[PDB]
Structure 1
């Protein structure tokens, strides 16, 4: 075969993972992105902790295919986003360490480090990194759903699909889960399943 990677997948730091008090008061609020970034330009590109965009290079420039969370040396994202492909961050290569297809989850440089928690009734913030947009924190109340084998919490699919991988956070600032894990419900709707929220 070839010794070059099939695709140029670059990470781009976008925001601190933390609970945003302004979004708790207003329902939503922008987050600072650094010099202050007034606008996000998807097509240009621009590891320690935070929320990252995942951008694929093509002839027309970069496309945001997803997002993810770096924590304690491990990058966390959605399986469907990278399909296990090797990632780059500023010339440093990151390799897949672990994956669960049914959860639509994958991590790079270690196992799952996400420790956010959620119990029915509590509110979370999606720290949305959408294609073309500065980071925005949006308060939401997850609903509880039955599996199949137990329970999961879920949020509504209210962001661009390229937002997949974006951290959803609790009041402690810990990541309960990632946006974009589309599952089908009993009554015909699709929602975003959180996990860590999973019990069985």
Structure 2
């Protein structure tokens, strides 16, 4: 085998994880990224926060997803990294736990995200889309019956490369991550919210 990594996946911090009062007023608001006026996907540029995940190629970096660092643990989607080792400023982060059905993976501990949602509350997607500065978008999840119980979901209203961005409740805690696409009986895909699942 090789002792080098198969892919160079780099983490880049982009925003604090919090509820944004402007987005509660207006429905959406820009978030501070540090001050950056434009995101340049192809360049690269742990503390708690929301990160982009960027893969190196010969043309530069591509943002393949995003995630959240909380309590020494990085959280992202299974589909985004498929368990690949991550790097942040020279530090290697290895996978600790995954649930392929929830499309979740954590690095450097088990799941730490403790947001909550119940029917009729609103949440904010703190979206880190490829090519865009972070934006908080407030939305009301819909409730779904699963074949084992229930789950809330939001509409797939951002780039696929936003997958892993946090979805926060009004306490600033992460109810789930954007981009776990699940199919409805009616044929629609929606983005299911991890912590809202009742099994």
TM over 0.5: yes
Q: Deviations over 1:94-149 (max 9, x none)?
A: 00000000100000000000000000000000000000000000000000000100
Deviation at 1:195, TM superposition (A): 1.5
Deviation at 1:48, TM superposition (A): 1.4
User: Which deviations, in whole Å up to 9, do the C-alpha atoms of 1:36-88 show, x marking residues without a partner?
Assistant: 10000000000110000000000000000000000000000000000000000
Taking the aligned partners of 2:175 and 2:29, their CA distance within structure 1 comes to 19
CA distance in 2, matches of 1:149, 1:81: 25
3-state DSSP class of the match of 1:119? coil
Provide TM-score, normalisation by structure 1. Answer: 0.99
TM-score (norm 2): 1.00
CA distance in structure 1 between the aligned counterparts of 2:194 and 2:62, rounded to whole angstroms = 27
Unaligned 5+ residue runs, structure 2?
A: none
- Three-state SS of the structure 1 residue aligned to 2:68 is strand
Q: In the TM superposition, what whole-angstrom CA distance separates every residue of 1:154-183 from its partner, at most 9, and x where no partner exists? A: 000000000000000000000000000000
1:60 aligns with 2:59: yes
Number of residue-to-residue matches in the alignment: 199
Equivalent-residue separation in structure 2 for 1:3 and 1:37 (angstroms): 36
CA–CA distance in 2 between the matches of 1:90 and 1:188?
42
- Equivalent position SS for 2:196: coil
